[PDB]
Amino acid sequence: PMQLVQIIIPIESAHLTVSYLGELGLLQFKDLNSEKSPFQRTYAAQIKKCAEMARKLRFFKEQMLKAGILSDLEVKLGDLEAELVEINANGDKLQRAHSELVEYKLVLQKA
Amino acid sequence: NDADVSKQIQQMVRFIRQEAEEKANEISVSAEEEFNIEKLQLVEAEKKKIRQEYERK
Amino acid sequence: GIQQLLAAEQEAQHIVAAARNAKMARLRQAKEEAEREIAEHRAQVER
Amino acid sequence: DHAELTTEQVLKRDIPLQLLRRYDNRSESHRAQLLDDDGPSYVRVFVSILRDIYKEETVEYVLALIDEMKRARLFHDKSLASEDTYEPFLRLLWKGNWFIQEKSCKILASIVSARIDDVLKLLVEWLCAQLKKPSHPSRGVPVAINCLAALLKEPMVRSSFVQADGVKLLTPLISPASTQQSIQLLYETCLCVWLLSYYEPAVEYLATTRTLPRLIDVVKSSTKEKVVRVVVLILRNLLPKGNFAAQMIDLGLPQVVQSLKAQAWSDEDLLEGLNQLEEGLKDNI
Amino acid sequence: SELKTTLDAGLLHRGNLLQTIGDQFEQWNLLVKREKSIYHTLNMLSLDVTKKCLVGEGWSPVFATKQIQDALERAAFDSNSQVGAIFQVLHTKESPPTYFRTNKFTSAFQEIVDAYGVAKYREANPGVFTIVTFPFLFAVMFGDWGHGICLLLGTLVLIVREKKLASQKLDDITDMTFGGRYVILMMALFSIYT
Numbered sequence: 001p002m003q004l005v006q007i008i009i010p011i012e013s014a015h016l017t018v019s020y021l022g023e024l025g026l027l028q029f030k031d032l033n034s035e036k037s038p039f040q041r042t043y044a045a046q047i048k049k050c051a052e053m054a055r056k057l058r059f060f061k062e063q064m065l066k067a068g069i070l071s072d073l074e075v076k077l078g079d080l081e082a083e084l085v086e087i088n089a090n091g092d093k094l095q096r097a098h099s100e101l102v103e104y105k106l107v108l109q110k111a
Numbered sequence: 112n113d114a115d116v117s118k119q120i121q122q123m124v125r126f127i128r129q130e131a132e133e134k135a136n137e138i139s140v141s142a143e144e145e146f147n148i149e150k151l152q153l154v155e156a157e158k159k160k161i162r163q164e165y166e167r168k
Numbered sequence: 169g170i171q172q173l174l175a176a177e178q179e180a181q182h183i184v185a186a187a188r189n190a191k192m193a194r195l196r197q198a199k200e201e202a203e204r205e206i207a208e209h210r211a212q213v214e215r
Numbered sequence: 216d217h218a219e220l221t222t223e224q225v226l227k228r229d230i231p232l233q234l235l236r237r238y239d240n241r242s243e244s245h246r247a248q249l250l251d252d253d254g255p256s257y258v259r260v261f262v263s264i265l266r267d268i269y270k271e272e273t274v275e276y277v278l279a280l281i282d283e284m285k286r287a288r289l290f291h292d293k294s295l296a297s298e299d300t301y302e303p304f305l306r307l308l309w310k311g312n313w314f315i316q317e318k319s320c321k322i323l324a325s326i327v328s329a330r331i332d333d334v335l336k337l338l339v340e341w342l343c344a345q346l347k348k349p350s351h352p353s354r355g356v357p358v359a360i361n362c363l364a365a366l367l368k369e370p371m372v373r374s375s376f377v378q379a380d381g382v383k384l385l386t387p388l389i390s391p392a393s394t395q396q397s398i399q400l401l402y403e404t405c406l407c408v409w410l411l412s413y414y415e416p417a418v419e420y421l422a423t424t425r426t427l428p429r430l431i432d433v434v435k436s437s438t439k440e441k442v443v444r445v446v447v448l449i450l451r452n453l454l455p456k457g458n459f460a461a462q463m464i465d466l467g468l469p470q471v472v473q474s475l476k477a478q479a480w481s482d483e484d485l486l487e488g489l490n491q492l493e494e495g496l497k498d499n500i
Numbered sequence: 501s502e503l504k505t506t507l508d509a510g511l512l513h514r515g516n517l518l519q520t521i522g523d524q525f526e527q528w529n530l531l532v533k534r535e536k537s538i539y540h541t542l543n544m545l546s547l548d549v550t551k552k553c554l555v556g557e558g559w560s561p562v563f564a565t566k567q568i569q570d571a572l573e574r575a576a577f578d579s580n581s582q583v584g585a586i587f588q589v590l591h592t593k594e595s596p597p598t599y600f601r602t603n604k605f606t607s608a609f610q611e612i613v614d615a616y617g618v619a620k621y622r623e624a625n626p627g628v629f630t631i632v633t634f635p636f637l638f639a640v641m642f643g644d645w646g647h648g649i650c651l652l653l654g655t656l657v658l659i660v661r662e663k664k665l666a667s668q669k670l671d672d673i674t675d676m677t678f679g680g681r682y683v684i685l686m687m688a689l690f691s692i693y694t
Contacts, residue, residue, distance in 0.1 A: 001622040002598040004590035005560040005569060008118065008553040010125070011479065012440055013581035017554075018538045020575035026568035027560035033546035042546050042554075046477055047539035054532040061525045067515065069522035077528055080521045087514035094507035101503060115588040119169055122551060123176035125582045129481065129552075130180035133441045137406055137448055137483050138187035140368065144413035145191070146198035147370055151415075154206040161210045169588075177550035395580040439580075 056081065216271075218316035218345050218355025225317065225353035226283035231273035235260035235285060239276045243283050250285040255294035261285035265300035265326075274314030278307065278322035279354035282362055291329035301326040305333035308341050313353070319345035320359035324366035336371035338363055343384035360400050364407035373417035377424045382411075386426035389433040389449075398439050405433055405445035412452035412459075422459055431466045443480035451488050454495040464500035472496045555586075559596035565589070600625050608680040609634070635683075639690035648692030655685040 005027055009017035021027075033042045041047075053074035060081035061071070067084070219225065223242035230239035234257035238250035250257045264285075265277035280286055281300065290300035304326035308318035318326070318334070319341035327334035342363060346356035366372050367382070376382035388404035408426070411417035434450055437443035450468070453459035460468070472493035482488055545556035560568065569587035577584035598621040602610050606627075613627040642648070658665065658681040665678055677684070 002559045002561045002596055003565065003621075004557050004592055004596065005565050006555070006557040006588050006590035007569065007572075007586035008122070008548070008551050008555040009572075009576060009585040010122075010553045010581050010583060011547075013576045013579035013585070014547075014554045015538060016579035016581070017572055017576045017585045018541055019534060020579075021568075021572050022534060022537050024568065024571070026564040027558045029541050030545045030556045030558045032544070032556060033542075034544045036543075038543065041543050043539075043542035047543050049476075050535045050539050054535060057525065057528055057532055060521070061529070064518050064522045064525060067518050069515075069518035071522040071526040071529070073528060073531055077525065080517070080524070084514055084518055084521065087510050087517065091507045091510040091514065094503045094510060098501070098503035098507060115169065115586065116172075118583070118586040118588065119172045121583040122173055122553070126176040126180055126550075126552060129440065129582075131183050133402065133406070133444060134481050134483060135183045135187040137409075137444070138184075139190050140364075140406075140410040141413055141448075141483065142187075142191040142194040144368070144410060146194040148413075148415050149195065150199045150202040154202055154209075157206050158209060161213050165213050173548075173551050395582065398580065 053078075060084075216313055216316075216351055216353060217347065217349070218313075218319065219349045219351035219353030220355060220357050221352030222279060222283065222321075222354040222358045223352075225275050225279035225313070225355075228276035228279065229272045230276050231264050231268045231270070232256060232260045235264050238285055239264050239273075239280050241280070246280045246286055247284040258285050258289055258292060258294035259296055261290065262295035262298035262300050265290065266298040266303055268314065271313050274307075274312050275317070275353070278304065278314035278317040279358075282317050282322040282325045282354055282358050284325065286325060288328040290326060291331060299329070299331075301329035301331045301334065305331075305337045308334070308337040315341075316345060317354040317358070320356075320363035320366070321345065321354060322358075324362045324364075327366055327369075327371075332369070332371045335366035335369045336375060338366035339372035339375035339381045340379035342367065342376070342381035343379075346384070361403050361407075364403070364410060368407055368410035368414055368417060370414050370416055373411060373414045374420055376411065376417055377420035382417075382420055382424035382426065386424055386429050389426065389429040389446075391432065391436050392442075398442055401433070402439065402441035402445045405430075405442070405449055409445060409448035409452045412449060412456075418453070418456055418459075421453065422456070427462060431463055431468075434463060435467055435471050437471065437480070440480055443478060444482035444485070447478070447480055447482035447485070447489055447492060450496070451482075451492045454492055454499075460495060461499045464496045468496040469493070469500050557590040557592075559598065561598070595620055598622075600627070605682040606631060608683045612680070612683070632686075635687045635690040638687055639694035642691050643694035645692055648688055648694070651688035652685060652692060655681060655688050659685060 036042070036044065038044045038048055038051075057074060057077045060077050063081060063084060064071070067088075226246060227240050227242035230236035232253070234250045234253035237252075238246040238257070238261060241249050250261060265281060268274040268277040277300070281290065281304065285300070288301070289295070291302060304318045304323040307314055308323045309315070314322065318337070320338050323334040323338045327338075342359065345359050345363070349355040349357075367376050385404065385408075389401060389408065392398040392401045408421060408430070412421050430446075430449060430453075433442070434446045437446035450460070450463070453463075475489040475493050478485060478489050480489070542554070545554060545558075547554040565587075569585075573584040573587050575584075597618060599618070600610070609631045610627045613630050619625065639648075658678055662681065669675070670678060
């Protein structure tokens with residue numbers, strides 16, 4: 001026997017209130033603002049930025065999985081992903097240089 | 112009623128205190144400070160011009 | 169409820185409008201008053 | 216006693232005609248509410264209530280009641296006769312009594328409403344003494360949180376704020392707060408600092424106040440509505456003043472400025488003001 | 501050789517960094533899930549600038565709403581906000597979807613029965629009778645007290661290994677079977693009796 005519940009969560013703690021509600025979970029979300037699309041809407045622009053951060057985090061996690069890793073926060077994750085990508089690029093460049101030098105050494109030894 | 116009316120009055124008080132004591136006060140004090148500074152900024156130049164005219168005389 | 173909450177918003181908007189008008193009012197009043205004061209100061213130079 | 220916290224008790228202390236005594240013995244706006252009953256008859260006695268107070272309790276009931284609000288510019292109006300309850304607060308601020316403790320930052324500011332600009336001027340040097348160690352219930356530092364702003368940010372006390380290190384003692388007011396009430400107090404203090412930066416002498420006094428680390432920390436950690444609003448106001452006020460913005464930009468101001476898309480701090484014209492402040496910080500960096 | 505050594509050192513440093521990067525991403529997954537939930541709530545539920553708050557309405561269990569709304573308001577107050585969240589009720593002529601509370605063992609049977617549909621907020625729930633009726637009828641079609649023991653033993657291992665089973669993944673058919681371990685055990689006991 002469920003029923004409708006109407007409340008207001010102040011912007012000073014709207015994110016905190018949402019997190020607290022999601023810790024346990026009692027009421028399903030409404031759909032009034034969904035007609036405004038991810039284009040701005042109520043906070044869909046903020047939702048768009050959060051989605052972009054989540055996409056960056058997902059790319060970082062996929063890169064870590066490809067590397068065999070074991071599993072402000074979004075900015076730190078992006079910085080870590082960029083550092084890992086730079087390290088991988090440096091390793092690939094060094095490996096290519098080693099391969100080229102080894103080929104040159106073999107050719108010179110044969111000559 | 113009860114919790115609902117308490118939330119309503121709390122919202123009214125918070126809104127009036129945030130808009131009046133925090134924001135409207137800021138606009139009023141900025142207006143007062145601008146009133147203090149801006150025209151004196153030209154009064155200084157007028158005084159300098161008057162001093163130059165007096166020196167010429 | 170919703171109507172009760174709307175009254176606080178309307179009061180806040182009215183206070184915002186008053187604060188907005190206060191800027192121009194204070195600016196003009198200070199300009200005129202300091203024009204009179206600067207005229208007096210320039211008269212002092214004559215003395 | 217010295218300055219204290221619960222301003223209501225001191226503002227309603229033992230009064231030094233009947234309406235003036237009630238005002239001297241009523242806390243907060245109740246003082247003015249009781250004083251307005253007799254009009255000029257109340258004002259004539261209220262003038263001497265603060266112009267003829269000598270005992271510590273009477274001087275406290277005069278000065279704290281003045282800070283709580285006949286305490287307005289009417290203290291030195293025509294109904295006050297020759298005696299005035301507004302101008303003498305300037306000289307009272309330099310003493311060491313309880314009334315002096317109040318007028319060090321708060322009571323003088325309220326008495327300066329008759330302008331009587333000396334009362335506003337005197338609130339800067341004694342601001343540090345106004346908040347030495349208030350623990351008792353009486354007028355003092357909490358009254359100075361907002362009432363003293365109109366005197367410190369005024370040009371009368373603008374230079375004196377940094378001349379006597381009064382603003383220097385108020386440097387950690389913009390530091391992060393561990394309580395919502397403390398957050399509101401810090402936001403009010405930062406708004407007062409911004410208003411001072413909107414004054415020509417206090418603009419240089421803020422730099423001379425040695426409060427740059429506190430302002431930088433407030434700007435970087437600005438998250439609350441009022442706190443971020445006050446931080447943005449201070450940043451906009453000090454932005455044209457060269458180093459006051461350049462040092463913050465070099466310290467990490469653009470990092471928080473880039474997050475202005477979700478500010479919603481209601482810093483007066485929050486949108487345009489935040490955009491201009493962020494653009495200036497980015498240019499200076 | 502020098503380039504290979506440099507590449508090996510860079511790869512080792514990258515792996516060492518990724519060792520902690522994955523650990524951080526483990527919690528970042530839940531953080532991103534919470535962010536996505538908040539984003540869905542924001543995009544689905546509107547807000548009032550006049551109220552300076554996120555407001556709306558939605559279905560909630562009355563028993564749950566007796567404590568959940570108060571807990572949310574208390575958490576909002578503890579979030580250093582000027583005021584906590586509201587807990588007001590709402591009314592409408594529409595009938596919200598609802599689900600009867602599912603127990604640890606009754607969940608599998610309830611899910612199996614619900615594959616035909618749902619009902620009103622407190623309407624008829626044939627799952628209550630069928631939780632035992634289906635074992636009370638499926639036993640007859642397989643009544644032989646030499647194989648029901650085997651079926652119960654097979655179910656018993658799944659119940660015992662549930663602690664490890666809940667963590668380790670298995671085959672899709674195996675996972676579906678393990679999802680109804682209690683129901684399988686009850687059916688096996690009924691078949692043994694039959």
